[PDB]
Paper text:
CDT is composed of two separated subunits, CDTa and [name], working in conjunction to exhibit the toxic effect. [name] is the cell-binding protein that assembles into pore-forming heptamers. Upon [name] pore formation within the host endosomal membrane, the catalytically active CDTa cargo is transported into the cytoplasm. Here, 2.5-Å and 2.6-Å resolution X-ray crystal structures of the antibodies [name]/22 and [name]/9, respectively, in complex with [name]—the CDT subunit that forms a heptameric pore for the delivery of toxic CDTa enzyme into the host cytosol—showed that both antibodies sterically clash with adjacent protomers in the assembled heptamer.
In addition, the nsEM reconstruction revealed that the [name]/9 Fab was bound to the flexibly tethered D4. This suggested that the crystallization of [name]/9 with [name] could be facilitated by using a [name] fragment containing only D4. Production of a [name] C-terminal fragment containing only D4 and complexation of this fragment with [name]/9 Fab yielded crystals in space group P21221 which diffracted X-rays to a 2.6-Å resolution. The structure revealed that [name]/9 forms extensive interactions with D4 at the oligomerization interface used to contact D4 of the adjacent protomer in structures of oligomerized [name]. Notably, the complementarity-determining region of the heavy chain (CDRH3) of [name]/9 interacts with Phe846 via Tyr98. Phe846 is a key residue in the D4-D4 interface, where it packs into a hydrophobic pocket formed by Pro790 and Pro835 of the adjacent protomer. In complex with [name]/9, this loop packs against CDRH3 Trp96, with the Gly848 and Gly849 mainchain atoms, additionally forming hydrogen bonds with the CDRH1 Ser31 mainchain oxygen and CDRH3 Gly97 mainchain nitrogen. Specifically, CDRH3 Tyr100A, CDRH3 Trp96, and CDRL2 Trp50 form a hydrophobic pocket that interacts with [name] Tyr812, with the hydroxyl group of Tyr100A also forming a hydrogen bond with the sidechain of [name] Ser813. In contrast, [name]/9 directly contacts the D4-D4 interface and clashes with D4 of the neighboring protomer. Furthermore, [name]/9 binding to [name], which would prevent D4 homo-oligomerization, blocked trypsin-induced oligomerization almost as strongly as [name]/22.
Author numbering:
A (entry chain A): 1 to 52, 52A, 53 to 82, 82A, 82B, 82C, 83 to 100, 100A, ...
B (entry chain B): 1 to 27, 27A, 27B, 27C, 27D, 27E, 27F, 28 to 212
C (entry chain C): 755 to 875
Write the structure that this text describes.
């Protein structure tokens, strides 16, 4: 059973360096080439380069010639990728993939992916802002200025599940911001309380924000 | 660099339909010594690693359903799903390995449904955010289809582009619609220099944009 | 120190480590034994690395690498002494099968970087 086990998620400051690993098992590590693929959030796949563990031969996408450094340890059957001079452009998911064929023909086995986030920010708890404004009324919740991902948003401790849209977070000014909307009948609000529950386990923070009529 | 062009970028399909997507190369991927086209197709579902479907342009990988079929030679290639299924909803990347390796931009499959206008709601900056010095005006555009839509911000009639951030949901698993959040963030002083803040949504379901507004003074 | 003729003559008797399927007819090479004789112990022990060029199923005739030799019981017989064994499983094939009865070349690497074609099929 072929398995590719990658390193855990990584955070790094700009201009620094990181080294990820791809633990290989279930096959002869030296008889297949190990490739690395980049995927920025919301974008497509991008080939970085490959290493031949048998002879340590490397081939790179010229975009990553100065950025990436591929190595391989035969004794441990582990492939490494070193990224240097990290910028915001490097924040992406990086896959290691085993390639079949003497010449590269296809990727038959992939790693689960290593998430890289480049930011000058350290762990920052979120600020939770209420969004108060027909038979239906839409309320909101603005979770702003936190780092790192993720935060989770529920409404009335899960009692409100339908009519909820929680939007993906955006990274701007080195901090994350997301919003969540909930739609309830106008007979329920403001007659009954609607509360926004925000959790940020990275900072061990739970915030409950009651949506009060403006 | 060998350039990979995939079309269409987005494809709305119905269950059971025949679905075809193309991948074109800037140079021939056919190796004359082995007479094989060094092109492969990969499927990626959200939150999962890519999985190979076809290699050598037309060789189906063991374990891939028979509904997937790749064809083409040289510079024009095609991936065909004889009967698209709900599990077939994903992004499909073509990849060359003739000279180095290059992925295509991908072709996304979405569930086709009837067009739906967005439910637009606008929100003033909260009092708690204003004590921090910032001011974010939030616009929700919920449950619309198709995904393509233009939203513009106008302060006191004048359009505003900078300081606007957008966020889309994936296609809703219940009703196959999309939702968007648009947030115009300004400084508290800038927010206090103007009165009217509006959010304008242009969607193919109507010729006239959907307008939601509020006046800071009221 | 053995001369080039002694090294080549020490690799004149060889056996292929094969796995054969009588039902499908397919054959796979695992490695190659170089037989120990009464007058070849010095030349065999003098060689430590082996370069192999093999015929891959889809990529064709390619150099599969230059690896250190292994010391295995000749023909897998425990009663037989250990001898030079070219283990093809440690060379680079991209997972491709080595065609058993197609072109194959094996070179012996001397410690002073001479390469001598010792097997040709």
């Amino acid at each position: 059973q072929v398995q590719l086990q990658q390193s855990g998620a990584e955070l790094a400051r700009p201009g620094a360096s990181v080294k990820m690993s791809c633990k290989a098992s279930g096959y002869t590590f030296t008889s297949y080439t190990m490739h690395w693929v980049k995927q920025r959030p919301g974008q497509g796949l991008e080939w970085i380069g490959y290493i031949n563990p048998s002879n340590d031969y490397t081939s790179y996408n010229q975009k990553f010639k100065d950025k990436a450094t591929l190595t391989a340890d035969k004794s441990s059957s582990t492939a490494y990728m070193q990224l240097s001079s990290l910028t915001s452009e490097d924040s992406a998911v990086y896959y290691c993939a085993r390639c079949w064929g003497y010449d590269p023909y296809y990727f038959d086995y992939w790693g689960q992916g290593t998430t890289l986030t480049v930011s000058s920010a350290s762990t920052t708890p979120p600020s939770v802002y209420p969004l108060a404004p027909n038979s239906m009324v839409t309320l909101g919740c603005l979770v702003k200025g936190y780092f790192p991902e993720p935060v989770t948003v529920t409404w009335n401790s899960g009692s409100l599940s339908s009519g909820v849209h929680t939007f993906p977070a955006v990274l701007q000014s080195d901090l994350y911001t997301l919003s969540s909307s909930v739609t309830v009948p106008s007979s329920t609000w403001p007659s009954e309380t609607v509360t926004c529950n925000v959790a940020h386990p990275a900072s061990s923070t739970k915030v409950d924000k009651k949506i009060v009529p403006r | 660099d060998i350039v990979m062009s995939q079309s269409p970028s987005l494809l709305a399909v119905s269950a059971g339909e025949k679905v075809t997507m193309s991948c074109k190369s800037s140079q021939s991927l056919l190796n004359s010594r082995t007479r094989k086209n060094y092109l492969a197709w990969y499927q990626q579902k959200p939150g999962q690693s890519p999985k190979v479907l076809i290699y050598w342009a037309s060789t189906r990988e063991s374990g891939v359903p028979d509904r997937f079929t790749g064809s083409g030679s040289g510079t024009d290639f095609t991936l065909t799903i004889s009967s698209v299924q709900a599990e077939d909803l994903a992004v499909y990347y073509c990849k060359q390995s003739y000279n180095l390796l290059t992925f295509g931009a991908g072709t996304k499959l979405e569930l086709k449904r009837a067009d739906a206008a967005p439910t637009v709601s606008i929100f003033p900056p909260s009092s708690e955010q204003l004590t921090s010095g910032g001011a974010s005006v939030v616009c929700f555009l919920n449950n619309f289809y198709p995904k393509d839509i233009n939203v513009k911000w106008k302060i006191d009639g004048s359009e505003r582009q900078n300081g606007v951030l957008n966020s889309w949901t994936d296609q809703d698993s219940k009703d196959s619609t999309y939702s968007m959040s648009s947030t115009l963030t300004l400084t508290k002083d800038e927010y206090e220099r103007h009165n009217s803040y509006t959010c304008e949504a242009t969607h193919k379901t109507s010729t006239s944009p959907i307008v939601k507004s509020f006046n800071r003074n009221e | 120190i053995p001369t080039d003729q002694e090294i080549m003559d020490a690799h004149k008797i060889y056996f292929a480590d094969l796995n054969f399927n009588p039902s499908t007819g397919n054959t796979y090479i695992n490695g190659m034994y170089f037989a120990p004789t009464q007058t070849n112990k010095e030349a065999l022990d003098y060689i430590q690395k082996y370069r192999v060029e093999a015929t891959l199923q889809y990529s064709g005739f390619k150099d599969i690498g230059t690896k250190d030799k292994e010391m295995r019981n000749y023909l897998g017989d425990p009663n037989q002494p250990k001898t030079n064994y070219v283990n093809l499983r440690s060379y680079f094939t991209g997972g491709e099968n080595i065609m058993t009865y197609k072109k194959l070349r094996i070179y012996a690497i001397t410690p002073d970087d001479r390469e001598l074609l010792v097997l040709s099929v």
